[PDB]
Amino acid sequence: GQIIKSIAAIRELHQMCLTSMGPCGRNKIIVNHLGKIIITNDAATMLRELDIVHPAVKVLVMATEQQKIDMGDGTNLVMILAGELLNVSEKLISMGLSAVEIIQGYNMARKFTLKELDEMVVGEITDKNDKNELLKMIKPVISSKKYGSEDILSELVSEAVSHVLPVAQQAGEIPYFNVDSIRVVKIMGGSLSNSTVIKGMVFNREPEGHVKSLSEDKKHKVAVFTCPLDIANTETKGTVLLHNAQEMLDFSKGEEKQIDAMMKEIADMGVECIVAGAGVGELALHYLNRYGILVLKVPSKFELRRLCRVCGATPLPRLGAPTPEELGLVETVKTMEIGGDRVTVFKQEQGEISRTSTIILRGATQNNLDDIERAIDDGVAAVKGLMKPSGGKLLPGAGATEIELISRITKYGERTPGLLQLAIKQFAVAFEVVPRTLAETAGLDVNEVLPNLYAAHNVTEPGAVKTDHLYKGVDIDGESDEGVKDIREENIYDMLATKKFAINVATEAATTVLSIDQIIMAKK
Amino acid sequence: GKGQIISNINACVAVQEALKPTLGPLGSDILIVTSNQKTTISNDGATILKLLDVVHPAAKTLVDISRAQDAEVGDGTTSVTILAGELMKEAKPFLEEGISSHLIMKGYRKAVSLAVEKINELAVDITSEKSSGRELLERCARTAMSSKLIHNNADFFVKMCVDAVLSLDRNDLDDKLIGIKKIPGGAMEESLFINGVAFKKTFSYAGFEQQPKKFNNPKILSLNVELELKAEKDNAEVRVEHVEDYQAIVDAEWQLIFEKLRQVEETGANIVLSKLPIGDLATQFFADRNIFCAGRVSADDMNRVIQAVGGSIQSTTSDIKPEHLGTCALFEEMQIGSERYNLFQGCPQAKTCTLLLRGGAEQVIAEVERSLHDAIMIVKRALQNKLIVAGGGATEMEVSKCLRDYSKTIAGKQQMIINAFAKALEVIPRQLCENAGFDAIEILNKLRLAHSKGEKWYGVVFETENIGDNFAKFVWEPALVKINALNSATEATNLILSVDETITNKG
Amino acid sequence: EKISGDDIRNQNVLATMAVANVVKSSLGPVGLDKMLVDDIGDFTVTNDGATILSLLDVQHPAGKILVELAQQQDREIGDGTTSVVIIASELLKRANELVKNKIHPTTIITGFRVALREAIRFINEVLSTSVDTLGKETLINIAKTSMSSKIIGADSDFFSNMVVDALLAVKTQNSKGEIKYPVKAVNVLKAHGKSATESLLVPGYALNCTVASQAMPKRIAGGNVKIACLDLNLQKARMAKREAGIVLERVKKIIDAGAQVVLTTKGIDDLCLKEFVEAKIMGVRRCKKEDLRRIARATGATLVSSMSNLEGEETFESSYLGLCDEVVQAKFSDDECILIKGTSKHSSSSIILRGANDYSLDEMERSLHDSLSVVKRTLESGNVVPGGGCVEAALNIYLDNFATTVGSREQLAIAEFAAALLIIPKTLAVNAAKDSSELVAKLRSYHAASQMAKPEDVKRRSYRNYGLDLIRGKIVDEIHAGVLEPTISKVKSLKSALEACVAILRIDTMITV
Amino acid sequence: ERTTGRQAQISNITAAKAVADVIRTCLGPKAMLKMLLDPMGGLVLTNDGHAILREIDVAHPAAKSMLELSRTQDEEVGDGTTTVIILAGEILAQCAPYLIEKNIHPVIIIQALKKALTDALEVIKQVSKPVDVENDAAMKKLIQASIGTKYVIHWSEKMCELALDAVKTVRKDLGQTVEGEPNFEIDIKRYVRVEKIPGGDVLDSRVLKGVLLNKDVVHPKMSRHIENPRVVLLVRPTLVITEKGVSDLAQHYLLKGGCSVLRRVKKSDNNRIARVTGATGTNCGLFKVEMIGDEYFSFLDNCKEPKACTIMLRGGSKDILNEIDRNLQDAMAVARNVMLSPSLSPGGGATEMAVSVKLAEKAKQLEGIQQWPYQAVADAMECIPRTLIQNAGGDPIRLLSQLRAKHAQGNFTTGIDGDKGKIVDMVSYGIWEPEVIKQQSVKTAIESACLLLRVDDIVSGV
């Protein structure tokens, strides 16, 4: 009976995910052995910080990572649904039904579900990229994570997406929106209402110079220099030493005249910003103050990649060769105080449209500060799902999808004769865990909300054409209500690309566990 | 599982139980022993809780909200931790009957919306009405000094406290700008208020330094490095090939320092300070020029001198520019405290001051030092924030009243939750009575009598046990405390009660 | 051994907790039966919680106190024993929590005694007699819910109007205005006439019998008539002109006394029947002995044992003859009955239930007496109170503001005593599958606004007596719902519950050899 | 001592389930034998469930309540004792995840079982087919199911005729809308009680209406034929019957009165005399005292049908009549069920499957909280025919799904055959069972399953 105990080991981790999806979800504090606390609400990121022992759970963890890499959303739907398929299959194994026909039954039920997803599409996203149109897709992503911030964070995320996207329609050949185009930064102090949207990267460090900001001139030239600032010498060794005091006057004045000569040629070309990836000497900062050149140091090589796609600058392996062809252009750069400290940000005006934006977060809570940082990353991948593979189609969410599939699957159960009826019926019952989870965690009675969900999708209408309301989902209440309410009032929908991809992954996840009747391992 | 929720509630009770006696000026103090063995005793809950470093994850939330309580507000760090923990203790029996935690946590935020609108109705903006500039600071100073050993000597202490905040900007005020140094010995009523900075008199050795301490207009100059010859610690070894050359080896420091001896004479700076110990070489030439200098100056002491005359620190004495110098009105070093302590007076540009205290023991002054900080925080928040509410249990007892009537009009499970939320608010006035020795059973029962008569200003008298009004007792608290505490306690309460699992990795 | 301190105080709570769990599921009519298994291996099946506590074996000083408390209510009231144990169990749990608050037990005891006398005065203010007789219906829904388990419950709507109107007039002064309803009255007959819903109420006594020979008139003496009840027959007497001459004198004392109605248990012969034709006297053969004994009380007559008393023989004219108005006989289907109305003093009536067959009427007649038992016991006491949680919920809110009127360390004891009454509706809703958190919470909101305008002697939408109906799952008034309880049962149950709670809290030491 | 919380509900389910799971092999003609280990060297080799359950020692009181149910069920009908226990135990098994894991209130389950009990009886009545109760040749085949494969197979031709007249004697057909439905007032225990007389013949054995006594006339010369004999129990009666003995002095006193003295009469037989007579004896049919089988008899019969009598059994020896006793009583239980209603039900598990199919389709239209436990009842109704499949060697997975699909197309009378093991029709192949057993199996199992869930705590005490 090892296959039964394997489900019980997953059942211990199943209840952990039942308290994740929904508005009742909470982040988990994990103390690493290196003395670092990583806090995230996302389940896929949580599995990376957790050490999995039993390899049977690793199959579900590897299936969860598939949801985060491609579609980036729906990781809670994959893990919870795959865990319920093992519970409904436990009764079939104990009943005497072999696991061979159980696996074959899921393959027939999966093909029947994918064909019905096209007829369940309610609305169609026009991909207008409007600020008001993006509020419908982003709202359910922020929902079931952090409560109360769905109204404020909806306008901040939707505004940054429209800045990095150009103007185009009905063209899917050339991709535009990437996953790195949206960066999230954090700073101590402020609130959510005072947060703004920046059209470019935000630098929270100090300029390290007496020049606070550049002028208002159009098309500022920005040059990225990987070579550090110093007098040109031999690449091999070349350490400056003083044998006697006579050579001190020649070596000291030589470094001052050589650096000043290189900065004069760069300032004449119209470059007001010099980006030095390496360290900057003491005498180099003295000449940059009189020429009015902004001092910027970016030691991280990851930040220079997204900078090349905005202004068009290119890193130069040498120093003192301001090639105008590889220089970048930015409309306006300003240094303002955001969050209590004066920092130099990066933005634009009209031309040189930036392909990367950054949203600044402000708040007095440290725990909820990193919560929004990890929550926006789940919303970034939602924009990627708007492409050709079923980006415009959408399905109603809030538990309305899993309940509606029950009536369609059971209708095809009696149509297919043979032993396949056992796996088809249990496949639809496994969808009942989603509506029960939201009602149990929210404190709603099972004897009340649950029977009203079945009566919402099942009614007696004297006619062939459907009518009344098929959009009624699972309601969290929170104030008062009688029965359930329409989901179309809050406009909470789920994309087809997210739901269709989550079904195929969850189906193959439970297939691997049921197919393994023996596990052989050894100590390390 | 469900057992982790109960285990997390009792884990916060052990931390809350220590913070209960620390509520109030007359309450008990926690004795904390750091790994460094340094012993610190104070009644301020901020520094206390920061020294616990509890491994339990939910206990870290109390530390996070304590930093925001001390930063944005600065007062009430003890009450915000007790109020946030009391809501979790009252919700323990509610979870054992099958009630989900989400309904209980949601009911807390329902009373928060009614509490924000209640504070605005209880906030009265008054400045010049029925008061003045001097009468406002004088009447509020004797309130924090009551029920203390300084109550008899408070007549001279209030006059020095009024002029303390007047020497600083009224728009921007900081409690750290007024320093307090413990001086053992002497009477407690002989202390005075000084605009400058004082030293610790670390030199117990005798036999030099004759000089009068009365100066007219000394010039202040900062020096970033130590300039000295005689050194008590290290020594120099000399081995060469000549007998007569043993002397000149240690003299390498002469010429460049010999020139710097007369540079101060040409500059005319009468005050020389450094963060490093200075030998007797600098104190040599300064005698005839009437130049005062003090060695082994702390790093925090020089930062207050730079902001005094507006000068700046320079590494050497050569390139010092004339704008780095500064001059005060008068320099007088008296024997107050049974020891000569240097001080500055008459600096118009000084952004900081120092309040000296005297007493027979250092522990007696430490009790007075923490008591004077409470009177400063009241004036600190009375300037920028114009909304003043009645504290000391007055507003606390009013919030619980109205919330009991609002629950009767709200059908559903929120009725018992809001009623329990207002019932948990009674821990604040209770603990204040237990710390002062007053009986919390009789007072809280008799206070609810007149509390329902329509007057919302009834407080708790901290001097003699009885019901009364804090308006006559001059007990005031800013409205920022009540707003920030209810928002931080509700967020911290709902964060811990929602924890279904405690995960800790070892390695 | 000798124990003391907080250890004995915790054992008292753990002892009453296991006892309360036994009566927790048996509270109310929705409760379920339980089994008691001894060391012998036998068991029993009963739904009564009072019989469980009698055979309950528990070794504990405070546990044995509840044993005598359960038997005290059974020997007198016999109802509400389950509710008393639950109240006394919650009072001990909340009293132990006050130990950490440094609350003295005597103050807890004094706080209960002062609140107990003041609670009775508050209950006496909301007490009311039977009302809503015109325009509304009260006693109708009592028999309707009791018959819901029988077929008669479908037709109980039409049958309740005949039973309530009958029993309403049955009350009489008894001895010095007692107004006590009898335990057995309103003899129910059966007939096959028409359907079950065609039964008609007869305001008076009804006897099932025939006239034998039909030559006698069925209606005579409209103005005044006298009924002669005689257990001795008028038929010729046998052993086991002498025997024929005795019955001739017995009839002579009848026609001379002016009795138009003659009832004989053993029948009347044919010779004595001929004399009744010329006198228009209606004879009845084969009377029931149990029927005629009740006629003497309804018609004011007296049963005659024998006519051989002393040396005389006669019917004692005018002594046993009662005052009646008219005796009318209507033709009925299947068996025919006799209608007697307008007697001297009767105040009673008879309900003849007609139906399809006698097989269904046998189950309806037995269920009618069981449904009447609940009605006659409620109407026995003129002072009644609505149940279903109306006593505990209305007093909970009143003691909140009333605790401030006394004070002096006794406010905390009153608050814990008031909140301890919410356990009765809580555990009652458990067996009804309804959520106990929603029903108890929403019940306080309705009673909160009910007492706001009560002392002002003015009201608009504010009503009192809000109950809890667990059958339909809605909040309705228990007066109209059909749930009513006497005041004597509630007062003695609440007072005796606190008597056993005081003796438990006063024990600080347990000495066992 | 005491069990509280959710653990008490699990102990109540597993108590009756552990007993029902063991007796699963006692159902059907293919039922496998069982072996119990007694402390004595003997053992129980029979497969009868009524004999095995009485010898099993149980601990939890829920199993004791299941034993009392088997005793009551065995008195009503001869067979089907294990069917009631298994059906009542499987319902608690299917409701185990709903009561524990799903956290469903037990009264909701109990209230749903009461509603499903009415719907289960209406489906069986529709599946049942009409049958003629007045046909003497048809009643012999209905009883033959309990005759063959037994020691009476040699007398089966005579047993079907003897069991027919034995049932026809106690039954009387009366009905009307005036006094209601008497339901024939048939009692096997008291009225059908039989007396075994050694000697005689089985074919010549007849059923006499009355009480038979072995005491003869107490006088040597007396009239053995009376026109209108009058039975008097203890007017100038024609007969005198005394419960106790009578001295010879009273013989000459009552001799001139024209009456016979009969002493030594049992007390239990006096109650049955009141049915043929009415004495607390006119119109008495036959007074003939003629000896039959070297034993003096008496005829109390008449021209009327009191529905009370003592059946006289005769055979080749006492050992033969002893086996006829339990065989005739079990055979009349099937014939009694035919007179309770003119309907028959398909055997082999077809009736069990007919309820589960109609319950799942009707429960979907109610749309309420009771809908979930209805699916657990339909699964329990399918375990009875599936249990026979496990004993028939066939695939329990394949034969269960293929049989359920045939109900949506074909009729509900198609069961499972024990001899073959494949899905076949019960009506065409001559497999029938009475409906009364089906009504008593569903009603008593649901009523007993609800009582086991009503006890949430085990109280220990005297």
From Swiss-Prot, chain A:
Q: What keywords sit in the KW lines?
A: ATP-binding, Chaperone, Cytoplasm, Isopeptide bond, Nucleotide-binding, Phosphoprotein, Ubl conjugation
Q: Which GO terms describe its molecular function?
A: ATP binding; ATP hydrolysis activity; ATP-dependent protein folding chaperone; unfolded protein binding
GO cellular component terms, alphabetically, are: chaperonin-containing T-complex; cytoplasm
Is Hydrolase tagged as a keyword? no
Positions carrying Phosphoserine are: S480
Where in or outside the cell it occurs: the entry states:
Cytoplasm
- InterPro entries per the record? Chap_CCT_theta, Chaperone_TCP-1, Chaperonin_TCP-1_CS, Cpn60/GroEL/TCP-1, GroEL-like_apical_dom_sf, GROEL-like_equatorial_sf, TCP-1-like_intermed_sf
Record's Gene3D superfamilies? GroEL, GroEL-like equatorial domain, TCP-1-like chaperonin intermediate domain
Pfam families attached to this UniProt entry: Cpn60_TCP1
What does this protein do, in the record's words? Molecular chaperone; assists the folding of proteins upon ATP hydrolysis. Known to play a role, in vitro, in the folding of actin and tubulin. In yeast may play a role in mitotic spindle formation.
Subunit organization: Heterooligomeric complex of about 850 to 900 kDa that forms two stacked rings, 12 to 16 nm in diameter.
Alphabetized NCBIfam families for the sequence: chap_CCT_theta
PANTHER family given for it?
Answer: CHAPERONIN (PTHR11353)
Q: Which family does it belong to?
A: Belongs to the TCP-1 chaperonin family.
Please identify the protein, giving its name as recorded: T-complex protein 1 subunit theta
Origin organism is Saccharomyces cerevisiae (strain ATCC 204508 / S288c) (Baker's yeast)
Curated annotation (Swiss-Prot), chain B:
Against InterPro entries, the record matches this protein to: Chap_CCT_eta, Chaperone_TCP-1, Chaperonin_TCP-1_CS, Cpn60/GroEL/TCP-1, GroEL-like_apical_dom_sf, GROEL-like_equatorial_sf, TCP-1-like_intermed_sf, TCP-1_chaperonin
**Record has ATP-binding as a keyword:** yes
Q: What terms describe the molecular function in GO for this protein?
A: ATP binding; ATP hydrolysis activity; ATP-dependent protein folding chaperone; unfolded protein binding
Whether Chaperone counts among this entry's keywords is: yes
Subcellular localization is given as: Cytoplasm
Subunit structure, as described in the record: Heterooligomeric complex of about 850 to 900 kDa that forms two stacked rings, 12 to 16 nm in diameter.
State the superkingdom: Eukaryota
Record's Gene Ontology CC terms?
chaperonin-containing T-complex; cytoplasm
Family note: Belongs to the TCP-1 chaperonin family.
Matches recorded under PANTHER family: CHAPERONIN
Cite a single GO BP annotation.
Answer: chaperone mediated protein folding independent of cofactor
The role this protein plays is: Molecular chaperone; assists the folding of proteins upon ATP hydrolysis. Known to play a role, in vitro, in the folding of actin and tubulin. In yeast may play a role in mitotic spindle formation.
According to its UniProt entry, this protein's organism is Saccharomyces cerevisiae (strain ATCC 204508 / S288c)
Keywords, in A-Z order? ATP-binding, Chaperone, Cytoplasm, Nucleotide-binding
Q: Give the protein's recorded name.
A: T-complex protein 1 subunit eta
From Swiss-Prot, chain C:
Q: Which GO terms describe its biological process?
A: chaperone mediated protein folding independent of cofactor; protein folding
For this record, an example GO cellular component is: plasma membrane
Q: Where in the cell is it found?
A: Cytoplasm
Q: Which UniProt keywords apply?
A: Acetylation, ATP-binding, Chaperone, Cytoplasm, Nucleotide-binding
Which CDD domains does its entry note?
TCP1_alpha
Entries under PROSITE patterns matching the protein? TCP1_1 (PS00750), TCP1_2 (PS00751), TCP1_3 (PS00995)
According to its UniProt entry, the function of this protein is described as: Molecular chaperone; assists the folding of proteins upon ATP hydrolysis. Known to play a role, in vitro, in the folding of actin and tubulin. In yeast may play a role in mitotic spindle formation.
Q: What NCBIfam families does the annotation carry?
A: chap_CCT_alpha, thermosome_alpha, thermosome_beta
Name of this chain's protein: T-complex protein 1 subunit alpha
Organism encoding this protein: Saccharomyces cerevisiae (strain ATCC 204508 / S288c)
Name the encoding gene, please.
Answer: TCP1
Curated annotation (Swiss-Prot), chain D:
Q: Gene name on record?
A: CCT3
What is the protein name for this chain? T-complex protein 1 subunit gamma
The record's Gene Ontology cellular component field reads: chaperonin-containing T-complex
Question: What GO molecular function terms would the record report?
Answer: ATP binding; ATP hydrolysis activity; ATP-dependent protein folding chaperone; unfolded protein binding
Principal place of residence: cytoplasm
Spell out the PANTHER family in the cross-references.
CHAPERONIN
- Keyword Phosphoprotein on entry: yes
Which cysteine pairs are joined by S-S bonds?
C303-C309
The record's similarity note reads: Belongs to the TCP-1 chaperonin family.
Origin superkingdom: Eukaryota
Q: Where in the cell is it found?
A: Cytoplasm
The entry's keywords: Acetylation, ATP-binding, Chaperone, Cytoplasm, Disulfide bond, Nucleotide-binding, Phosphoprotein
Q: Which residues form the signal peptide?
A: none
Provide the assembly information: Heterooligomeric complex of about 850 to 900 kDa that forms two stacked rings, 12 to 16 nm in diameter.
Q: Which GO terms describe its biological process?
A: chaperone mediated protein folding independent of cofactor; protein folding
Function in brief: Molecular chaperone; assists the folding of proteins upon ATP hydrolysis. Known to play a role, in vitro, in the folding of actin and tubulin. In yeast may play a role in mitotic spindle formation.
